[PDB]
C-alpha cells in the first residue's frame, strides 16, 4: 500500500546507462596527471640525446639538421674516397 519512492530509491538507479559507464572513465583520467607542463625533461646530452636536445628537437625540426648530417656524411666520404679512389 506504500507509495512509490523515486528519490528514496536512487541507490540502485544511476544516471541513465552511458553516463554511469563513463563516470569511472572520466573520474580517474583527470586525477593522476600533471597540473601544467610539469616535468619537461628537456635536458639530455648523450650524443644521441645531445642531438635530441640540440637540433633534433620537435619545436622546429627543420631541414637544417638533415643538411648538417649530409655535410658530415660527405666530409667523411671525401676521406673514404681518397683512401679508396
Amino acid at each position: 500500500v506504500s507509495t512509490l519512492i523515486p528519490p528514496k530509491v536512487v541507490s540502485s538507479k544511476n544516471i541513465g546507462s552511458a553516463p554511469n559507464a563513463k563516470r569511472i572513465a572520466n573520474v580517474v583520467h583527470f586525477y593522476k596527471s600533471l597540473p601544467q607542463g610539469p616535468a619537461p625533461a628537456i635536458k639530455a646530452n648523450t650524443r644521441l640525446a645531445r642531438y635530441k636536445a640540440k637540433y633534433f628537437d620537435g619545436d622546429n625540426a627543420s631541414g637544417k639538421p638533415l643538411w648538417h648530417f649530409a655535410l658530415g656524411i660527405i666530409a667523411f666520404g671525401y676521406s673514404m674516397e681518397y683512401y679508396f679512389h
Binding site: 633534433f56 620537435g58 656524411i73
Partner: protein, 221 residues
C-alpha cells in the same frame, strides 16, 4: 656495404626514438612524418587486401614499404647509397617474396592453389591452354619485382654519375659560362627531382604489387 646498411637502420630507428621529446599525444615534428605514411599504408592495404586476415598479413608489406622507400631516400646523397651499386638484394628478396606467397597459397588452399592459375569460369576446350597461359607469368613475376626497383634506383645513380663525369669542360676552359654551357647541371637537377619522385612513387607501387600477390596467395581469384 655492411656499414652503409646500418646507417639506414640508425636513421629510421631515430624516426621515433630520437624524435618524441616526451612522447606527447599531439605528436612531434617527425612523428607526423611516420604516422602519415602509416595512415596511407593502412588505407591502401585495407583497400587492396580488404577482408579477413588483412591485418595479420599487413605488417610484412609495411616492413618492405619502409625498407624500399628509405632505400630510395638514401640514393639522394651524392655518394649515393644505391645498395653500393650492386642491387642484387632486390632480386633475391623478390624471389623470397615469390616463394613466400607460393607457400602461402599452398598452405591456405593446397590443391585449390593450383586453381589460382585457372579462373572461375572457362570454356572446356580452351582451359588446357589458358592454364599454361596463366602459370608461367606467375612463376616469372619473381624478377619483375626486382628489375623495377633496380632499374629506377641504379639507373638514376649511374645517370648522375655519367653526367658528372661528362661535365669536364663547362667553366674551366669553355667560354660559355651560361645555362647553354651548364646544360649538364640543369639536367642533373631535373633528373634528381625526377629521381626523388620516381623513388617515392615506385615504393608505393611496389607496396601495391606485393599486397596484390599476397591477396592472390591468401585468397582465390
Amino acid at each position: 656495404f655492411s656499414l652503409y646498411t646500418i646507417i639506414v637502420l640508425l636513421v629510421i630507428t631515430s624516426l621515433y626514438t630520437l624524435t618524441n621529446n616526451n612522447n606527447k599525444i599531439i605528436g612531434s615534428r617527425w612523428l607526423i612524418s611516420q604516422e602519415a605514411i602509416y595512415d596511407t599504408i593502412m588505407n591502401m592495404t585495407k583497400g587492396q587486401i580488404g577482408g579477413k586476415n588483412w591485418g595479420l598479413y599487413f605488417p610484412m608489406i609495411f616492413t618492405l614499404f619502409m625498407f624500399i622507400f628509405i632505400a630510395n631516400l638514401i640514393s639522394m646523397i651524392p655518394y649515393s647509397f644505391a645498395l653500393s651499386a650492386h642491387l642484387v638484394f632486390i632480386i633475391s628478396l623478390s624471389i623470397v617474396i615469390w616463394l613466400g606467397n607460393t607457400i602461402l597459397g599452398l598452405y591456405k588452399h593446397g590443391w585449390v592453389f593450383f586453381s589460382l592459375f585457372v579462373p572461375a569460369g572457362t570454356p572446356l576446350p580452351l582451359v588446357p591452354l589458358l592454364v599454361i597461359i596463366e602459370t608461367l607469368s606467375y612463376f616469372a613475376r619473381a624478377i619483375s619485382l626486382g628489375l623495377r626497383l633496380g632499374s629506377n634506383i641504379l639507373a638514376g645513380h649511374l645517370l648522375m654519375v655519367i653526367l658528372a663525369g661528362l661535365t669536364f669542360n663547362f667553366m674551366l676552359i669553355n667560354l660559355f659560362t651560361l645555362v647553354f654551357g651548364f646544360v649538364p647541371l640543369a639536367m642533373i637537377l631535373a633528373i634528381m627531382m625526377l629521381e626523388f619522385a620516381i623513388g617515392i612513387i615506385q615504393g608505393y607501387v611496389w607496396a601495391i604489387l606485393t599486397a596484390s600477390y599476397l591477396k592472390d596467395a591468401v585468397y582465390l581469384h
